[PDB]
Amino acid sequence: SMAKVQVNNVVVLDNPSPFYNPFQFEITFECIEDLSEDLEWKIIYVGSAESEEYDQVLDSVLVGPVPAGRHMFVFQADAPNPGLIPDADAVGVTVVLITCTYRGQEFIRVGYYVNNEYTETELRENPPVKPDFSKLQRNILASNPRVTRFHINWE
């Protein structure tokens, strides 16, 4: 069958923000017909390129009833746990992902680069071994989303 859900756009809200602020995404999509089963959205923070074990599922949203037509919703998730981020990966560029599954199958993955940078010159010039997350600013590169679609069984 044809893809029954088509994501139209994601707006990154509160985009330059302190590291400890929650993520906020305003997501619009279309359903070509009433879906009987649930859509599950997730936000996944890539703690390190070292390994997927440093991935953090920040939150999941499950919608039981699906109606046909255009949709908008706002997806908010708490910031990642800095205790689980390797020291060498915290300051710099990482990735945050938005995924959606239907009947348990991921059909779309929207990835953004995330640039975490210090706000004080002293910290930028002499970064501590353990990063000071209270002084880190998160900038999501909202203009350059990377979209991957997956074929799933929509019936």
Author numbering: 2 to 156
What do the authors of the reporting publication say about this deposited model?
In order to determine how TLK2 engages ASF1a, we determined the crystal structure of the human ASF1a NT domain in the presence and absence of the N-terminal TLK2 peptide. Apo-ASF1a-NT crystallized in space group C2 with seven molecules in the asymmetric unit, while the complex with the TLK2 peptide crystalized in the P21 space group with eight complexes in the asymmetric unit. The structure of apo-ASF1 NT domain was resolved to 2.1 Å and in complex with the TLK2 peptide to 2.71 Å. The ASF1a structure exhibited little variation between the chains in each structure, with an average root mean square deviation (RMSD) of 0.65 Å between 153–155 residues for the seven chains in the apo-ASF1a structure and RMSD of 0.39 Å over 151–154 residues among the eight ASF1a chains in the ASF1a·TLK2 peptide complex structure. Notably, aside from re-orientation of side chains interacting with the TLK2 peptide, the ASF1a Ig-like domain did not display any significant structural changes between the apo and complex form, with an average RMSD of 0.59 Å over 151–154 residues between chain A of apo-ASF1a structure and the eight ASF1a chains of the ASF1a·TLK2 structure.
